[PDB]
Write a protein that binds this ligand. Structure first.
Ligand SMILES: Cn1cc(C(N)=O)c([C@@H]2CCCNC2)n1
Length: 164
């Protein structure tokens, strides 16, 4: 059973106008099997619109491609993103009063490199409010996190969404 195609696609922005379907494919086939690979072009001039997309056979291949950034394609560093609200911070809710920094770190560090963990406390009492923010060094960590159906941290089923 195949993962949904939408989860296997990478939008590639910032292309060289000389990049073709063929040269984009030759580049990104290094990290997996490509079932689709298109450069977007003007319908009348055929001049590149400077972006395109590739579809891999599996999500693990998408991961491999994202972990191989930066990608220099036909001499230009391009900008791949999963199928955009491009942020590096998440809101994590439902962690109650017993969840600590190391719980959040041990779980979320496997999505990306963590720069800040902020466990929210009440301004008046100092009691934990039951939510936190995690800031990563890169947006793909967040993009991987928010497409999961479930997040279990410290036994709690958590609500996770993009923050600012
Ligand atoms: C969100 N926030 C701001 C402050 C503050 N310093 O005004 C606080 C205090 C710090 C101690 C524990 N929570 C209460 N929490």
């Amino acid at each position: 059973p195949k993962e949904p195609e939408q989860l296997r696609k990478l939008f590639i922005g910032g292309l060289s106008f000389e990049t073709t379907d063929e040269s984009l494919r030759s580049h990104f086939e290094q990290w997996g099997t490509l079932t689709d690979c298109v450069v977007m072009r003007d319908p009348n001039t055929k001049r590149s619109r400077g972006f395109g997309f590739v579809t891999y056979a599996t999500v693990e291949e998408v991961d491999a491609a994202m972990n191989a950034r930066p990608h220099k394609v036909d001499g230009r560093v391009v900008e791949p993103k999963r199928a955009h609200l491009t942020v590096k911070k998440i809101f994590v809710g439902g962690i109650k009063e017993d969840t600590e920094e190391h719980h959040l770190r041990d779980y979320f560090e496997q999505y990306g490199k963590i720069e800040v963990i902020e466990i929210m406390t009440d301004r008046g009492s100092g009691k934990k409010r039951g939510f936190a923010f995690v800031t990563f060094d890169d947006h793909d960590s967040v993009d991987k996190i928010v497409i999961q159906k479930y997040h279990t941290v410290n036994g709690h089923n958590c609500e996770v969404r993009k923050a600012l």
